[PDB]
Design a protein around this ligand. Structure first.
Ligand SMILES: Nc1ccn([C@@H]2O[C@H](COP(=O)(O)CP(=O)(O)OP(=O)(O)O)[C@@H](O)[C@H]2O)c(=O)n1
Ligand SMILES: [Mn+2]
Length: 347
DNA sequence: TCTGGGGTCCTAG
DNA sequence: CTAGGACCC
């Protein structure tokens, strides 16, 4: 018996969804962003089709930037209702396969297949591609390995519309020259710190003395990085309801903000908006965090724990309005954010 | 071609 | 008990 982990990632997801209802736009540059107006400032690309990516457009890029880089791209507004519906369909469809299925956000899922040892993980991956293509119209890629992090890395190589197998057999030969941030979990900061320790590749980190890392990163993070560099990872595909820990709404305003009357009303509204949504989900708030960001793009957040789990609107808005009070100035605030942390204990 | 929004987790003081 | 650093989709 061979335990496989398959990572299923829908290609160009938001674009592909748009493509189902604009099938004339296939093989053309399509950019999905804040409101379909590229001229609109303070807005960014949410998803760039593969054709738009050939001109350098990528998620995070301001839409003005991307229209300069790709003037013939069709810009479409974000339509979250249509993406929730596309997502639940394809997943709902992948539950119908009878393997354990772990869903990660919207596009992506992990599938646990224990295969007799007669069978072919490549074989299962194509079916998933064929059924997904045939029933939803969307295209997916599948990375295959024996643990979640390495399967995800395999998806990187499987894209677009493909399948890639990444195991102990080929991990180090495929990945050993890559910089540490190619690993899932590792970003530019860690890379930079590892660079300052003489570790500039996956292969270097894999043979790095445990002590160096556990002194530098903590006795659990240090060993985890070593695990990751050797291609290790989580191996259990948990098929259970994901329970959110928090919900949050931030907003960067069309105009910079200076007078506090606006600032208070925004954090009040964010607080209430957030709280109704979690009241709908049968959740209780534990702590209220407020975020401010200046014209600098400075950015700092503050949290306060409620005296007791609560759902009380007045007590929560006041806490949010009280935490906003601590932030120093009444500058040009670019962005205001409220996150509610939720109880994790019972229902 | 001035910089989005929703998340999780872990470790310092 | 919190600050925020770091990564992720
Ligand atoms: N910064 C980000 C990164 C991602 N997302 C959202 O997450 C989905 C997939 O992430 P993803 O990272 O797998 C990309 P996908 O669009 O499927 O392209 P691919 O086929 O080559 O992977 C996207 O369609 C975005 O709306 C976002 O809002 N902000
Ligand atoms: Mn994805």
């Amino acid at each position: 018996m061979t335990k496989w982990v398959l990572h299923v990632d829908l290609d160009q997801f938001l674009a592909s969804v748009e493509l189902r209802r604009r099938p004339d736009l296939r093989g053309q540059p399509v950019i999905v962003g804040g409101s379909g107006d590229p001229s609109e400032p303070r807005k960014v690309v949410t998803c760039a089709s593969y054709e738009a990516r050939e001109f350098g457009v990528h998620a995070g890029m301001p839409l003005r930037a991307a229209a300069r880089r790709c003037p013939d791209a069709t810009f479409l507004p974000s339509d979250p209702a249509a993406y929730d519906e596309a997502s639940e369909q394809v997943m709902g469809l992948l539950r119908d396969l009878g393997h354990p299925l772990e869903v990660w956000g919207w596009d992506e899922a992990y599938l646990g297949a224990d295969l007799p040892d007669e069978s072919d993980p490549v074989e299962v991956a194509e079916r998933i591609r064929t059924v997904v293509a045939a029933e939803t119209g969307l295209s997916c890629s599948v990375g295959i390995s024996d643990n979640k992090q390495r399967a995800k890395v395999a998806t990187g190589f499987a894209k677009p519309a493909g399948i890639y197998v990444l195991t102990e057999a080929n991990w180090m030969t495929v990945m050993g020259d890559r910089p540490p941030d190619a690993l899932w979990g590792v970003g530019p900061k860690t890379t930079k710190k590892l660079a300052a320790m003489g570790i500039t590749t996956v292969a270097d980190l894999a043979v790095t003395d445990p002590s160096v890392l556990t002194t530098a990163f903590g006795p659990s993070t240090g060993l985890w990085l070593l695990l990751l560099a050797k291609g290790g990872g989580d191996t259990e595909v948990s098929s259970e309801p994901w329970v959110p820990r928090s919900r949050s709404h931030v907003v960067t305003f069309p105009q910079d903000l200076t007078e506090r009357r606006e600032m208070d009303s925004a954090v009040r509204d964010l607080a209430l908006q957030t709280l109704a949504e979690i009241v709908e989900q049968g959740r209780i708030v534990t702590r209220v965090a407020v975020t401010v960001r200046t014209s600098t793009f400075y950015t700092r957040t503050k949290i306060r724990k409620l005296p007791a789990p609560s759902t009380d609107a007045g007590q929560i808005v006041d806490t949010a309005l009280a935490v906003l009070d601590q932030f120093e100035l009444d500058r040009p605030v670019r962005l205001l954010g409220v996150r509610l942390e939720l109880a994790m204990d019972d229902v």
